[PDB]
C-alpha cells in the first residue's frame, strides 16, 4: 500500500490537494422551514458527490475492497459534512457557513423542529476549533481520520493508516513549534472533539429519518440510500 510509504509532508500535500470545493446554495429569503430543509438537503446531496471523489483520494482508501469503502462512507458521511461545515464556519462566530451564500445563525434554526440544538452544538464545535486555532493541515487529517475510523469496528490496514495520520498530526504540531507536552495534549483535544462530532451525527440521522417518514422534504435517492444504511 502506497499510503504507508508516504512522508508526513507527502501525506499533508496529498490531502490538501484532494480537498473538495465549497459549493453554493440555490439563490434568491426569510426561510420557510421547508424552504430551508430543501436548500440544505440539496446542498448535502451535491456535496456527497464530491465527498466520494475526495474519499478515493485519501491515502490508503483506494486499497480497500469496494464494500469496505461503501461501509466507511455510509458510516461517516454526515460526520464528514459536519466537520466541513464546522471548519468553514470558524471565521464566522455565531454563524454557520453552509455555503458562501447560505450563512445561518442559531435564530434561523428555530424554523425547523429540533434544529436549534444541533445549531448550538455545531456552533460550539466551531468556536472550539476557533479558540484552538485549528490549522487547515490539522483539519484535513481530522476529516481523513473520521472517514477511516467511524465505520472500522463495524466490519487492520486501516489502523496502520490511522497511525500514519496520527504521525502526521504530531509532525504538524512539532513544526508549528509546540512542546512535547503541548503536542500530545493538542492531539488529545482534537480527537475528543471527534466523539462530539459523532454524537452530532447520530442526532442528525434521527431527524433525517423522521423527516423522511414525513415526506414533506424532498430527499434524493442517494441521500435516502445513505440514510437507509444507518438502519
Amino acid at each position: 500500500s502506497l499510503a504507508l510509504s508516504l512522508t508526513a509532508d507527502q501525506m499533508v500535500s496529498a490531502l490538501l490537494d484532494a480537498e473538495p470545493p465549497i459549493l453554493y446554495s440555490e439563490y434568491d429569503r426569510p426561510f420557510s422551514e421547508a424552504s430551508m430543509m430543501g436548500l440544505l438537503t440539496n446542498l448535502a446531496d451535491r456535496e456527497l458527490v464530491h465527498m466520494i471523489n475526495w474519499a478515493k483520494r485519501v491515502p490508503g482508501f483506494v486499497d480497500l475492497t469496494l464494500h469496505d469503502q461503501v461501509h466507511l462512507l455510509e458510516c461517516a458521511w454526515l460526520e464528514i459534512l459536519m466537520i466541513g461545515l464546522v471548519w468553514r464556519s470558524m471565521e464566522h462566530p455565531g454563524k454557520l457557513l453552509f455555503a458562501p451564500n447560505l450563512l445561518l445563525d442559531r435564530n434561523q434554526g428555530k424554523c425547523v423542529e429540533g434544529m436549534v440544538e444541533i445549531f448550538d452544538m455545531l456552533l460550539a464545535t466551531s468556536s472550539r476549533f476557533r479558540m484552538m486555532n485549528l490549522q487547515g493541515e490539522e483539519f484535513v487529517c481530522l476529516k481523513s481520520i473520521i472517514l477511516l475510523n467511524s465505520g472500522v469496528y463495524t466490519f487492520d490496514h486501516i489502523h496502520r493508516v490511522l497511525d500514519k495520520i496520527t504521525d502526521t498530526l504530531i509532525h504538524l504540531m512539532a513544526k508549528a513549534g509546540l512542546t512535547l507536552q503541548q503536542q500530545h495534549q493538542r492531539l488529545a483535544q482534537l480527537l475528543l472533539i471527534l466523539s462530539h462530532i459523532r454524537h452530532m451525527s447520530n442526532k442528525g440521522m434521527e431527524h433525517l429519518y423522521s423527516m423522511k417518514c414525513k415526506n414533506v422534504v424532498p430527499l434524493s435517492d442517494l441521500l435516502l440510500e445513505m440514510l437507509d444504511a444507518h438502519r
Binding site: 458527490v49 466520494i52 478515493k56 461503501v70 435517492d221 442517494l222
Partner: peptide
C-alpha cells in the same frame, strides 16, 4: 443496486 457503488467506481 447502490448509487454509492456506481459513484465509487466512477
Amino acid at each position: 443496486h447502490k448509487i454509492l457503488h456506481r459513484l465509487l467506481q466512477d
